[PDB]
Write a protein that binds this ligand. Sequence first.
Ligand code: HEC
Ligand code: HEC
Lengths: 104, 104
Amino acid sequence: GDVEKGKKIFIMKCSQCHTVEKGGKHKTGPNLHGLFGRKTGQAPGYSHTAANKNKGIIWGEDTLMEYLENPKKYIPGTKMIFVGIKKKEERADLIAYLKKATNE
Amino acid sequence: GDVEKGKKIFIMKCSQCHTVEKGGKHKTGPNLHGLFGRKTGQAPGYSHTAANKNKGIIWGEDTLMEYLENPKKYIPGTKMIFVGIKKKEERADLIAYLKKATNE
Ligand code: HEC
Ligand code: HEC
């Protein structure tokens, strides 16, 4: 994926509720630093729903591709109220950005 | 926005389900008094959906512009069954009316 395009998608669609940088603030949603390789619902210092804590999957490209297409379908009971990103290429670009931004 | 045009839009498209005045009754939808500056899904005495309670954003001009364009896109799971207002000028006029009427 294209990280430059992914950053723009993040700003447009996600930044209302999330930060990505190390030590970045929790907003409506959790700060996402450290996301990849982590079990669902373990953002440090954030109060997740039981649903997000109990999904049990490991965040990576494939599980994010599915979640971000339709969050409530993947995690019924989530408090993330976001319709999803329909286009596969857009999710791929977004996820490439997240992979970079949440690990630097 | 044009408050007088906004009032007409409100009567035509919204009043079947909503009141705006202080102490106004809940109908299908919540009374909207006090809307601006409030987090989503906090209308006093009204039973909101989890989705409207969890969206977690603050109502204001920009967030209402987006919500009213396509309610279910912004708040998937909403029980507000309303298509939206397509035209930006109409949304802006409506929102100007709401900003006045829900604060007086
Ligand atoms: C506010 C209306 C949100 C928008 C827009 C987006 N997200 Fe979100 N997200 C939000 C909340 C409230 C939560 C917690 C959900 C819960 O039930 O506890 C989340 C969670 C996520 C997660 C999971 C984090 C984890 O398990 O560690 C991810 C990966 C996530 N959000 C990503 C994300 C992206 C990439 C968005 C733009 C496409 C996005 N969210 C939008 C609230 C909101
Ligand atoms: C009945 C068919 C509706 C019409 C027409 C409109 N709205 Fe509505 N609205 C309705 C319901 C049942 C709800 C509650 C939704 C839920 O899931 O809990 C709402 C909610 C709103 C809100 C949010 C209120 C809040 O979070 O405090 C707003 C701002 C709102 N409605 C505005 C609104 C406007 C301006 C309308 C005309 C364009 C309108 N609604 C139509 C039901 C119905």
